[PDB]
Design a binder for this molecule. Structure first.
Ligand SMILES: [Mn+3]
Ligand SMILES: [Mn+3]
Ligand SMILES: [Mn+3]
Ligand SMILES: [Mn+3]
Lengths: 203, 203, 203, 203
C-alpha cells in the first residue's frame, strides 16, 4: 500500500536479449513504470483514509474513490500493477511451456498450448492503440483470453490475471518498430510459465 | 441461487396507502418483479456451472459470464436484486428517520437526515429515463448517494446498497403520472429505517 | 429555432381511442412534451450565439455545445424532436400500411410490411428501460431498424428518422401497465403511413 | 473515394531534422499510414455501394455502415485522415506562428498564440495511451482544443480539424523515447501555420 514502490526488475537489463533489447528493458522499467509509481503516490497522498489499501483493491473499487483521483488511480495504479506482473513473468530460467495445474486447465479448456498461443496472439494483435493482452481466471474456474485498453487491469472487472503481454508501442518500438507480430513471436521465448503457475494457484 | 424465486412481498398490497397505491404494489411485485425472476432463470438455465452462485456474485462478475447471457443477467438479475431490497425497505412499522449506527454515519458524513433527504431527492430527480437512486456504503466506510440507469445495481461497482428508491415510471405512474417529485415526497413516509440499519450493519 | 414551441397535436386527445387513451394523449403532450420544450428553452436562454440553430443541428453537434447544457440539450432537445415526429405519425385518417416510395423501399430491403413490423416490434420490445424504436434512412439509401435509449434521437448518429415508436412507460402505462406488447400491437392501428411517406421523401 | 491513396509526403524524410528524425518520418508514412490505407481499402472492397463516398463522410456516418466494417473504417479511415492532415501541417517553409484569419480567431478566443500553445500542450500531454491533440472549429464559429483516443478524428462529432498533433508513441519513440514533452516542444518548430490558415478558411 501507500507509499508504493517501484519493484526490483530482478535480473540484468540484457537478460532477455535478443528477444527484447536492453535499452527497452531499462527505459520500460525505470522511466515508464517509475512514472506510474510516482503519479499513483502523488494521487493518493491527499487522502490518508486510502493509505492502507493494496492497489488491487483500489482498482476493484474505482467508483468509490474521490472523483478527482479516479482517472489517476485507474491509469497509474493499473500501470503499476500491470508492469509489476510483467517483470515477474519475464524472469529468466523458467518453463517455456505451461506446466502443472495451469497446464491441465489450458489443455482442458483450450485444447493445449498451441491453441492458447494462437488465441493470445489474436487478442494482442487485435488490440488497436495502447493496451495489454491477457490470460485470466474468473471465480468460477474458467480461463479467458481478452485484451484491455491503455493500463486497465482485468481485476477491475473481477478477473485474476495469470499472463499479461504489454502491447503499448513503447514495449517494442526500439527494436521492432511497427512490427508488433515479430515482437509477439519473440515474447514466447521469454515467458516464465513457473511464474504463471504460481499466479494460477494463488488465485 | 438458481432457480431464483420471487420473494414474498410481506404485507398487504394496500399497506402503503395513500402514499403508494395498491394496484401499483400488486403489478410492481407480481408482474414486473415476477418477470425479472422468470427471465433471470431462463438465462441461467443453460449454464449449470453458474447454478450455485448468488445473484450478487453474478453481478460483480458480469464480464466473466457467457456473452449470450451477460445483458440478460445484468437487466434481470439487477431487476431481481433491486426490487427484493425495495420490498423489504418498504416494510410497515419501522423507524421513519435514521436510527442507530446508520444514523451516526449519516450525521457524521452528511450532517444529518435533512441533508441526506435533499441529496437523495436530487439524485432521484436527476436520473433521466429509468433508474434507481441509492444510498450505498463502500469498503472504506464512506457513504455515497448516486443513481444508476435501468436495473443496474451498485454491487456491480463494488458498493453495498443501503437504501434504493425505484424511479422507473412504473413505480409511480398510476397515481402520480409525470409528478416524480410528489412520489419522492411520499416515499419518505414509508421507508423503513430499521431495515436500512440491518443492511448497513451486515456490510 | 429558439424559443422553441410545443406544436399542437392537430387532433383531439380522444382521436386514437380505444388504441391509446385520451388521458395519456393529454398528459403525454401537455406535461411530458411541454416540459421538454420548456427545459430546452431554459438551457438555451444563456447562449445567444445558439439562438438561430434548429434543434436537429444542435443534436448533431452536441460535442460543440457548452459543457453545462450538453445533457439538457440532448435530453430535452431529443425529447422535443422525438415527440414532435410522434404526434405527426399518429395523425388520424392516413394509410394503414406503407404506401408510395417508402413502400417500395420496404418491399426491396425488408421483404414486405410483415417483415418490417416484426423487426420493429422486436426492436421496441428489446429496448430495456426508456427509449424509442425507429425505422430510419441513412445517406446511402439504406433503411435500418434500431432503438435508442431515453430521448436520444437517431439524427445524433447521422440517420433521418422515418417512423419512431415511444416505448417509455408513460406512453402506455395508464392503459396497458406492464403490457408493452399489447401497446405495440395497438400502435399499428394508428400509425399514419402517408406521413411516414412524407418523411421518407424529404429524407 | 475508394480505392483510397497514400498521399506523398511532398518533402524529403529528412526535412524536419533535428526536430523529427528521418527514420521516423519514413516508417510513420510508409509503414503506419500505408497500412491504414491498405486496411481501409480491404474493408471497403466488399461493399460497392460505399465506393463513391469520401472518408470524411464514412466517418460521420459510422453507425450506418455494415457492422463487420465499422471498427475497421473507424480505425483505418481515421488513421488515413489524421495522417494526411498531419503531413500537410508539417510541410517545411511556412509561417511559424499563426497568421491571417486563424490568427484573429486565436487572439479573440484564446487570448494569443501563447495561451493556445499551453492549452494544446496540456491536451497532448493529458491524452493517456494513443491519441491525437487537436485545434478544431465547430459550425458556430468557436475554436476548441480537445484530444481523441487512438485514430478517432473530430469529424465524427461534427468538428472540422485545423491542427492535429499525433501523440501515439510511434510518432516520437525513436528519438524521444518516453519524453513526450520534449517531442511537443519540438513540434512547434515545424508546424506550418500557413497550412493551418488554409484549413481554417475552408472550414
Ligand atoms: Mn509498458
Ligand atoms: Mn420497479
Ligand atoms: Mn414520450
Ligand atoms: Mn501516427
Amino acid at each position: 500500500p501507500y507509499p508504493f514502490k517501484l519493484p526490483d526488475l530482478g535480473y540484468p537489463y540484457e537478460a532477455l536479449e535478443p528477444h527484447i533489447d536492453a535499452k527497452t528493458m531499462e527505459i520500460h522499467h525505470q522511466k515508464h513504470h517509475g512514472a506510474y509509481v510516482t503519479n499513483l503516490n502523488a494521487a493518493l497522498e491527499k487522502y490518508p483514509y486510502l493509505h492502507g489499501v493494496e492497489v488491487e483493491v483500489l482498482l476493484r473499487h474505482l467508483a468509490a474513490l474521490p472523483q478527482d483521483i479516479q482517472t489517476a488511480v485507474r491509469n497509474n495504479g493499473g500501470g503499476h500493477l500491470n508492469h509489476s506482473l510483467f517483470w515477474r513473468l519475464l524472469t529468466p530460467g523458467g518453463a517455456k511451456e505451461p506446466v502443472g495445474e495451469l497446464k491441465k486447465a489450458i489443455d482442458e479448456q483450450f485444447g493445449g498450448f498451441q491453441a492458447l498461443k494462437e488465441k493470445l496472439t489474436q487478442a494482442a494483435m487485435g488490440r488497436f492503440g495502447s493496451g495489454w493482452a491477457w490470460l485470466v481466471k474468473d471465480p468460477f474456474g474458467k480461463l479467458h483470453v481478452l485484451s484491455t485498453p491503455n493500463q486497465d487491469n482485468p481485476v477491475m472487472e473481477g478477473f485474476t490475471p495469470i499472463v499479461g503481454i504489454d502491447v503499448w508501442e513503447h514495449a517494442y518500438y526500439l527494436k521492432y518498430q511497427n512490427r508488433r507480430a515479430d515482437y509477439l513471436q519473440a515474447i514466447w521465448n521469454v515467458l516464465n510459465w513457473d511464474v504463471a503457475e504460481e499466479f494460477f494457484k494463488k488465485a
